[PDB]
Amino acid sequence: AMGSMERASLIQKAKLAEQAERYEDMAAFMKGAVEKGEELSCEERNLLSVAYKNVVGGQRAAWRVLSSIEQKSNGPEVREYREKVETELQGVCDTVLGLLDSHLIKEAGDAESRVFYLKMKGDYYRYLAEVATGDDKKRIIDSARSAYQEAMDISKKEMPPTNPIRLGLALNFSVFHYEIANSPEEAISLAKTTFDEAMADLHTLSEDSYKDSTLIMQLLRDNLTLWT
Template structure:
C-alpha cells in the first residue's frame, strides 16, 4: 500500500481535528493529485465525521424546541449550550475541508482533470450547505451563496465534459437538487434539476460503464425517490428531507 493511501485510510480513524490536520498535512505535502481511491477515502472519512455532527445537531435542535415549550430556563440553557458546542465542532470540520479544497485539491487540478474538478467543487458545495444548515442571518446568506456558486460551477463543467450516466455527475445533481429543496426552499427548481438529471441518464443508459453501473443506478434511484417525495410534499403542503 502506498504512503498516501495509508495516510488517507488513517483518516477514517482520526475524528479529532488536530489528528486530521496532521494526517492531511502529510497527504498534501506530497503535492501530487490524489488518485480516485485516495480522493474517495478522504471524502468518506470527512463525511463520516461531519455526518455525526449533523445528526447530533438535528436531534439536539428538536430537543431544544420541546424544552423551550416547557419553559424550564435551566434546561433551556443547557440544551442551547450543547447545541452551540455541536455547531462549533461542525463548523470546524467544514472549514477544515473547505480550506483543503481551496488551498490544495481544487487549486492543483489541471484544466483537463474535469472529473476531479467536479468532484471537489461538489464537495465544496456540500460543506457550505452543511454550514448553511446551522447558520442564521447574514452568515447563512454568505454560505448559501458560496454553496450555490460551487454547485453551479461543477454543474456546468459536468454537463460539458461528463456523460449523463457518470456517477459523479449524477451525485452532483442529487446534492444540488437537495440544496435547492432544503436550503433555498425552491421545490420547483429542485424537481426540475433532479428530473432532468434522471431523464438524461435514462436516455443514455447504453453508455453506462460496467464498472460504475451499481453507483450510477443507485444515485438514479435516489433522484427518483426524492422526486416522488418532493412532488408528494408539494401536493400535501408538507416539508420533507431528501436523500443526500
C-alpha cells in the same frame, strides 16, 4: 501532526481506519496526505470524501437531536451543548473548505477532479448553511450555490450524463435547492432532468458502469418520490 509520516503511509492508514470505522482518524490521515502538496488520485479523493462525510454526518445528526430538544424547551445547558457541537461541526467544515482552497481546487485541471472538489465545496458550505442564521446565512448559501453551479457547468460540458460524479453532484445540488434554498420546484426539475438524461445514456454502458449509474439514479428517484 502528520508532517512526519510518509504520504503512502498516511493513505495506507486511512484505508485501515476506514476498515475499523475510525472516521476521525481516517479524516486526519487524509488531511495529512493532502497537506503533502501532491494532487490526489481518484481513489484518494474518494478516501478524503468518505472520511469527512462520516465525521460531519455524526456531527449533523447530533446537532439535529440537540436543536430539537432546544426548540421544544422554547437553564442554559441545552443551548450551550448545542453550540459546542455546532462549533465543532463548523470547524470540520472550515477544515475541509481550507483543504479545497489550499490548494486542491486550483491544481485540479481534469474535469473528474475539478467537479469532485467543487461539489465538496458546495456540500460543506451546505452543512455550514444548515446551522447558520440570518444574513450570515445568505452569503454561506450563495457560496454553496456558486460552487455547485461551477461544478454543474463543467460536468455538463465535460462528462456524460451517466457519469457517477455528475449524477451525485446533481443529486446534492437538488437537495440544496429543496432543503436550503427554499426552491422545491428547482429541486424537482433538476432531479427529473438529470434522471431522464441519464436513462437515455444507459445503453452506452458496460454492466459494471450501468450498476454504478443506476444506483445514483435510484437516489434521484427516491427524492422525487419524497418531493412529489
